[PDB]
């Protein structure tokens, strides 16, 4: 139960920094997340820890939204705000679907960070693919398909291929990066 205290302290520090910078959306979301961590301090131990991991993911998403808003592009910022809202909405206790949607949400947060880093480095094709994939994962998590498990597995595979392309671009190997981008685009487009 001591991890919850650390997570709440970090979330409140994020809220303080957001209030200092003037990001009211991130401040409101951090306050909501702190209240959610408060109201979930006691309960079943097997689920409290998973909800704390979800709260850690949400705090990282808030950090990503904050740095995206501070350092320019608002696409990543708005997508991360929506992702944090989705995480806070699903935390409210639909376990059989939340245990599956939380992995997809964390993958979406990773893809958002990928898009932000790639845009800050001029690799705008990876950033476009990452934004498209993050939109796909967000619409799948918020959607009521209930066939979402297979589509989310497909999207996570595409996200890992995109991560491979990102690492290739960071290392300087464009020949494999373009092929990985093509493969990820094919995997994502196979969802229609």
């Amino acid at each position: 139960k001591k991890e919850a205290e650390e997570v709440a302290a970090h979330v409140e520090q994020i809220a303080f920094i957001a209030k200092e910078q003037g990001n009211e959306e991130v401040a409101k979301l951090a306050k909501r997340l702190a209240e959610t961590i408060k109201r979930l301090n006691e309960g079943t131990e097997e689920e409290v820890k998973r909800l704390l991991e979800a709260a850690e993911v949400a705090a990282h998403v808030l950090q990503i939204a904050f740095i995206a808003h501070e350092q320019g592009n608002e696409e990543v910022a708005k997508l991360a705000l929506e992702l944090a809202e989705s995480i806070l909405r699903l935390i409210e206790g639909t376990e059989e679907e939340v245990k599956r949607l939380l992995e997809a949400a964390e993958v979406a947060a990773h893809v958002l960070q990928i898009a932000f880093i790639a845009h800050e480095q001029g690799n705008e094709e990876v950033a476009k693919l990452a934004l498209e994939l993050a939109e796909s994962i967000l619409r799948l998590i918020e959607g009521t398909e209930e066939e979402v498990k297979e589509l989310l597995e497909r999207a996570e595979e595409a996200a890992h291929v995109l991560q491979h392309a990102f690492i290739a671009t960071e290392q300087g190997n464009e020949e494999d990066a373009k092929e990985a981008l093509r493969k990820a685009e094919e995997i994502l487009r196979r969802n229609a």
């Binding site: 970090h10 994020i14 950090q63 740095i67 960070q113 990928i114 491979h164």
Partner: peptide, 12 residues
């Protein structure tokens, strides 16, 4: 397993 994700940003 999969290649590791980029690390989370620095805590504000």
């Amino acid at each position: 397993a999969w290649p590791a994700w980029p690390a989370w940003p620095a805590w504000p």
